[PDB]
Amino acid sequence: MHLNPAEKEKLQIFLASELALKRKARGLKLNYPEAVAIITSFIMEGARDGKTVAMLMEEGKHVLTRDDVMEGVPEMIDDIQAEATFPDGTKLVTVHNPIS
């Protein structure tokens, strides 16, 4: 596979997102790391899909809403940042205030 250090680490994010999505699907209000994981994996999969950085900067604000998460979680997340390989190489996506 030739996995580098980042590829190994970022597998964890995907896994944490899968965990969090199962928790959401069985009716739980998500906590801080769960919410961060879901939005982060969303961004990295979006890059893999070939979306632009600008698309993901905006889409990232519509992944989870405040009714999906526990009290105070929206205010705990000032931004989420993630890097992934886009068609044009690694780029950084910054999503400001992803959950209103």
Binding site: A6, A16, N31, P33, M76, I80
Partner: protein, 570 residues
């Protein structure tokens, strides 16, 4: 020109009179004073103040009052106060708390806090900064326990063990000169401060004392090795000669004596009573009465902290494993059961709140959680505010008195008890620069950056392949202070005066900083900061009801805590 308070706090952190919520608790701390000069705040970055000829002095060499490191705009939470200041570090020690910058052009610069060519900057604006936690009940069972401790803001581990041997899995003991030497060598690779306890057992002095001469920093008396009147007596005789502390886990079984017999053997000498409530061990059911006595330095371990609806149910099987007991032996089960009492656990919450139990500790991996001493201290304080109300000592709607009482339990008090408070345990000038930065939203839960001897040792930080350090995954990671030979300069091995005098560090090739254990035989409960209360504690032998000043101490278990499911992935 004036700045409104909201905008001021968002740029520089809070100032005098502002309050900050601790994590998701209902505890609020208020800034008591601020060492700054408004308009001359230090800050670093693009176009900021700490630049040559401006807030950074360009004239002085490192020796001329210049710092190695300035933490700008820290909100300090310490037994000494809750206040706003810059913190200046040099040679790995805190040298100034006050106002840093450049006396060329700024008013109110503390004279030895010059930002110069030699100065690194950490931005503490918007962070709470505390001393590193001092955990004095550590079982050295699994080296993976060190990162667990660092992640919750612990910077000193005192205890014993050789790994996952049954003796160590039960008791904080590194037995004898050879095991002690081996573990001192192991310690060279552990990125945390360490002191090692020998076995406080014997009926002759020499087998006990030779552990102190070998490099132990104290002793543990534990019932699993025979917490007999003889072992108690000999250990304290050794400790009084050697100037080290003795920790005791007493005779739960009451086999050779009741509590009063243990106290008679102690004979007024200084002792650290571990897990004084007794789930972690001790004369059943009344061990917690220890915490009333002037010669006792009392700590709790963490699984009983605080009293919750699931606390009792986890304990029996935990105890059975730790103490190598068998389910099919009725007297093993009876011994275990005798230690587990909701009456004393409930009273333990209140005794903490009253300043009658002075210290917290983990009991890491032997009925305790290595990364939850700090966590559970604040959960206890929060529960007590909810159930008891603000303490009478509070003012302006803040919880500062409670916050000082509780922070002392895991910082200064264990350091005083162990004879190491000249080096660690508080944010004071002249002490080692073991500092923990916390975002208030994560306070007591997950440390931001842990500084050890003036260099960052552990941090919550992101993708090492990214353009900046903030992208995911943000996780706890060891930093440069732990790498190569820097691990030697950023950590202290605490040892007895005799082992130091006898050249043990040179004999073993120890390269870590060597700290001397001292002044621990001439202290008592009166010396426990904000937790100095002596009183008669009565524990009913039939009902386990706990009384102080004729009043029954009891409270309800809670179904939910803060600093819990909002934060943790599992």
């Amino acid at each position: 020109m004036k700045i409104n308070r909201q905008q001021y706090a968002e740029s520089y952190g809070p100032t005098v009179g502002d309050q900050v919520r601790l994590a998701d608790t209902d505890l609020w701390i208020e800034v008591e004073k601020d060492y700054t000069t408004y308009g001359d705040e230090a800050n670093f970055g693009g176009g900021k103040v700490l630049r040559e000829g401006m807030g950074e002095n360009g004239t002085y060499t490192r020796t001329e009052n210049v710092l190695d490191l300035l933490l700008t705009n820290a909100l300090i939470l310490d037994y000494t106060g809750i206040y706003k200041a810059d913190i200046g570090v040099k040679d790995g020690y805190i040298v100034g708390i006050g106002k840093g910058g450049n006396p060329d052009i700024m008013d109110g610069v503390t004279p030895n806090m010059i930002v110069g060519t030699a100065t690194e900057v950490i931005a503490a604006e918007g962070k709470i900064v505390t001393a590193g936690g001092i955990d004095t009940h550590v079982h050295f069972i699994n080296p993976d326990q060190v990162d667990v401790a660092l992640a919750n803001g612990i910077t000193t581990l005192f205890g014993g063990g050789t790994g996952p041997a049954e003796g160590s899995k039960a008791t904080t003991v590194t037995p004898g000169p050879w095991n002690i030497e081996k573990m001192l060598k192991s310690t060279e690779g552990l990125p945390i401060n360490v002191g090692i306890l020998g076995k406080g057992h014997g009926s002759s002095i020499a087998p006990i004392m030779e552990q102190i001469d070998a490099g132990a920093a104290g002793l543990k008396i534990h019932e699993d090795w025979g917490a007999t009147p003889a072992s108690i007596d000999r250990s304290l005789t050794v400790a009084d000669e050697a100037d080290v502390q003795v920790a005791i886990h007493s005779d739960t079984l009451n086999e050779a004596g009741f509590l009063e017999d243990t106290l008679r053997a102690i004979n007024g000498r200084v002792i650290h009573s571990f897990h004084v409530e007794g789930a972690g061990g001790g004369h059943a059911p009344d061990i917690m009465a220890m915490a009333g006595h002037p010669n006792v330095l009392p700590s709790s371990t963490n699984p009983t902290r605080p009293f919750t609806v699931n606390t009792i149910d986890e304990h029996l099987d935990m105890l059975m494993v730790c103490h190598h007991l068998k389910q099919n032996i009725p007297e093993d089960v009876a011994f275990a059961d005798s230690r587990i009492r909701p009456e004393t656990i409930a009273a333990e919450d209140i005794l903490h709140d009253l300043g009658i139990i002075s210290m917290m500790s983990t009991d890491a991996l032997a009925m305790g959680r290595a990364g939850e001493m700090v966590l559970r201290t604040w959960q206890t304080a929060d529960k007590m505010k909810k159930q008891r109300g603000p303490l009478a000592e509070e003012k302006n709607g803040s919880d500062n008195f409670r916050a000082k009482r509780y922070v002392s339990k895991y910082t200064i008090n264990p350091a005083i008890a162990q004879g190491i408070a000249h080096e660690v345990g508080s944010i004071e000038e002249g002490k080692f620069a073991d500092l923990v930065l916390w975002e208030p939203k994560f306070f007591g839960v997950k440390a931001d950056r842990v500084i050890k001897g003036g260099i960052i040792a552990y941090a919550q930080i992101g993708d090492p392949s990214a353009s900046i350090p903030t992208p995911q995954p943000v996780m706890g990671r060891r930093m440069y202070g732990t790498v190569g030979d820097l691990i030697h300069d950023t950590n202290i091995t605490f040892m007895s005066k005799s082992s130091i005098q006898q050249g043990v560090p040179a004999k073993l090739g120890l390269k870590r900083r060597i700290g001397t254990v001292k002044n621990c035989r001439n202290i008592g409960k009166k010396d426990m900061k904000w937790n100095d209360v002596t009183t008669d504690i009565d524990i009913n032998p039939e009902t386990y009801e706990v009384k102080v000043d004729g009043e029954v101490l009891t409270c309800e278990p809670v179904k939910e805590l803060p600093m819990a499911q909002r934060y943790f992935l599992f």
